[PDB]
């Protein structure tokens, strides 16, 4: 099956664009990346940086995740991100989202060898 590291890339990486260019970015990406296949995922975040720079966060500042685990890390610098949040008109299979573009530090959980991101915890 798809590995946790591969799933993180599919759900949270968009190195092909520097930022969301329109209000329809989330509606198109949530569908294209197959995140609305079984149900409308309520919230998701896409990171507009090189995969290498995001993977490097696993060697930066260690912080506890929201749930208490201690394998989470916060990026030293801010990154270009896009937050997708389900709107009131969203109804499966026609999931709808609001696109919000911002520059924030990201916090990810890391696992494995190579030690890489497998979960997006938050943006601060």
From Swiss-Prot:
Keywords from the named record: Disulfide bond, Endonuclease, Glycation, Glycoprotein, Hydrolase, Lyase, Nuclease, Secreted, Signal
**Where is it expressed, tissue-wise?**
Pancreas.
Q: Where in the cell is it found?
A: Secreted
Say which domain of life the source belongs to: Eukaryota
Q: Which GO terms describe its molecular function?
A: lyase activity; nucleic acid binding; ribonuclease A activity; RNA nuclease activity
Known catalytic reactions: an [RNA] containing cytidine + H2O = an [RNA]-3'-cytidine-3'-phosphate + a 5'-hydroxy-ribonucleotide-3'-[RNA]; an [RNA] containing uridine + H2O = an [RNA]-3'-uridine-3'-phosphate + a 5'-hydroxy-ribonucleotide-3'-[RNA]
- Gene Ontology biological process terms from the UniProt entry: defense response to Gram-positive bacterium
Residue positions annotated to bind substrate are 7, 10, 41-45, 66, 85
Major place of residence: secreted
Q: Where is the active site?
A: 12, 119
Q: List the disulfide bonds.
A: 26-84, 40-95, 58-110, 65-72
GO cellular component terms? extracellular region
This chain is glycosylated at: 1, 7, 34, 37, 41
Q: What broad class of enzyme is this? A: lyase
The consequence of residue 119 to A is: Loss of activity
**EC numbers, comma separated:** 4.6.1.18
Q: Which family does it belong to?
A: Belongs to the pancreatic ribonuclease family.
Subunit and partners: Interacts with and forms tight 1:1 complexes with RNH1. Dimerization of two such complexes may occur. Interaction with RNH1 inhibits this protein. Monomer.
- Biological role: Endonuclease that catalyzes the cleavage of RNA on the 3' side of pyrimidine nucleotides. Acts on single-stranded and double-stranded RNA.
Could you tell me what this protein is called? Ribonuclease pancreatic
Species name: Bos taurus
